[PDB]
């Protein structure tokens, strides 16, 4: 019943509204993932929308160097599962893109896309 991640950006890409979601290190360790093409609920302004997952990628969050940190933790036999919680807590982020297909209103009517 809790939200999946955190929304950090939104825009309109052509005829479709889209938003970017970020999964944090605390959520990923519990096994929370988003499949591609999966249907999710988007809550905004007290109103519910149907969204679909399109893209997923990895991007650094904040001012950090994931490559150097991971290489240094690799040349040493450092098991990031449980040896170094602090290093794992700044590099375990993931980004997803979600389109807003529309919404359900009245008694099952589908309002397509959105103007808001």
């Amino acid at each position: 019943e809790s939200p999946i991640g955190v929304v950090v950006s939104s825009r309109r890409n052509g005829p479709w509204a889209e938003l970017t979601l970020v999964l944090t290190p605390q959520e990923l360790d519990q096994g929370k993932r988003l499949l591609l093409g999966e249907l999710v609920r988007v809550s905004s302004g007290g109103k519910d929308y149907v969204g679909m997952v399109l893209d997923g990628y990895y991007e650094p969050v904040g001012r950090s160097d994931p490559t150097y940190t991971l290489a240094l933790a690799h040349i040493n036999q450092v098991d990031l599962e449980k040896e170094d919680p602090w290093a794992r807590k700044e590099v375990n982020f993931y980004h997803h893109r979600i389109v807003l297909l529309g919404r359900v209103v009245q008694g099952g009517l589908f309002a397509p896309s959105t103007r808001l």
């Binding site: 150097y68 240094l72 040349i75 040493n76 450092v78 170094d84 602090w86 290093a87 700044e90």
Partner: protein, 358 residues
């Protein structure tokens, strides 16, 4: 005249000491840092964010940036102190404001810690020297120091009580204190010795030229070495640097560590000559076995973030360095209070001049 006429004098002799000083380090025994052994839980002390943007970006009035906190294990952290730092008008009598808080009938959480530190080890205002009364930024130079010292003493005698037998204390910085007047550190040494405390303040990376010629020799010992070890710095390297910092560093009257200095390497592979090294100092009443157990405790908490830091040190920074955009946050709040207070139109005049310059 373009760089010509170098006329360099004898510098081979300068390298002669560097060669023989390295031989002394090689003579010193190295205690291997194996993964098996006993270790102490950590309680890292950190203030951070106190200096901030100095005054040229701060409003210069009610410049509240002092914020000292601590962290423990995975949630054993103590409540943070975020002392309200007043304006310059009340600081025109540097002794006056401190007495107004120490002698105040009601004690703030910051005032309680300062009061607690005063009667725990008998610290009097005559022991603080005159550096805090020298100038304005000089007052904040050692106000943070006593606040940092108070945060450690207050937690021991008020928050933690008797259980200080299984918690290693880590201080982010050098043990040595400046502006002592030969009494601030004398009361600190015997107070710690009587309680048999485990205060081992680490500096991890130190600085490029925080020391004199010792930083050069220390740098090349680490790179040519292999694996993990514990090394006690011989006094000869320390003796040279202590007398030098007067003629190279700032007004550093009082720089020798209160005890002994130990260096260690936390990572076998580093990609760089000086990565993975940790420098920490111990009180004089701690021996080799105490130092080895302390070094093993740091290795169990080691991390790979900047250059192989101590881990709990950087975690404590995130809990005590909440400054970010202080000048924008404080300025809007300051005008909010001045608008809702008396006048109700003097604030409009105040904005007219702040927006003009500075």
């Amino acid at each position: 005249d373009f760089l010509d006429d170098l006329r360099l004098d004898h510098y081979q002799d300068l390298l002669r000491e560097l060669d023989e000083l390295y031989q002394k380090l090689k003579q010193e025994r190295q205690v291997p840092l194996h993964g098996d052994g006993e270790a102490y839980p950590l309680l890292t002390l950190t203030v951070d964010g106190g200096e901030g943007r100095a005054f040229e970006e701060l409003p210069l009035l009610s410049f509240g940036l002092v914020r000292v906190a601590a962290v423990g294990v995975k949630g054993f952290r103590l409540p943070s102190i975020a002392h309200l730092l007043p304006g310059y008008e009340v600081l025109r009598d540097p002794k006056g404001y401190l007495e107004g808080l120490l002698e105040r009938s009601e004690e703030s959480p910051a005032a309680d810690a300062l009061k607690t530190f005063f009667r725990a080890t008998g610290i009097s205002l005559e022991d603080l020297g005159e550096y805090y009364t020298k100038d304005l930024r000089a007052f904040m130079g050692i106000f943070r120091d006593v606040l940092e010292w108070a945060y450690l003493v207050w937690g021991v005698e008020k928050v933690l009580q008797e259980s200080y037998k299984d918690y290693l204390f880590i201080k982010d910085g050098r043990l040595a204190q400046l502006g002592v007047r030969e009494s601030f550190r004398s009361k600190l040494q015997n107070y710690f010795a009587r309680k048999h405390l485990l205060l081992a303040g680490v500096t991890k990376r130190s600085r490029l030229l925080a020391e004199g010629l010792t930083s050069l020799v220390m740098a090349r010992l680490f790179a040519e070495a292999r694996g993990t070890f514990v090394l006690q710095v011989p006094q000869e390297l320390m003796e040279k640097a202590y007398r030098y910092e007067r003629q190279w560093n700032a007004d550093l009257e009082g720089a020798f560590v209160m005890g002994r200095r130990y260096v260690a390497r936390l990572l076998e592979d580093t990609f760089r000559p000086q990565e993975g090294v940790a420098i920490f100092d111990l009180p004089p009443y701690l021996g080799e076995e105490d130092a080895v157990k302390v070094a093993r405790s740091l290795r169990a908490h080691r991390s790979v973030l900047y250059g192989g830091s101590v881990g709990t040190v950087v975690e404590a920074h995130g809990r005590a360095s909440v400054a970010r955009s202080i000048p924008r946050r404080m300025e809007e709040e300051i005008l909010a209070r001045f608008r809702k207070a008396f006048g109700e139109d003097l604030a409009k005049k105040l904005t007219e001049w702040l927006r003009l310059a500075d």
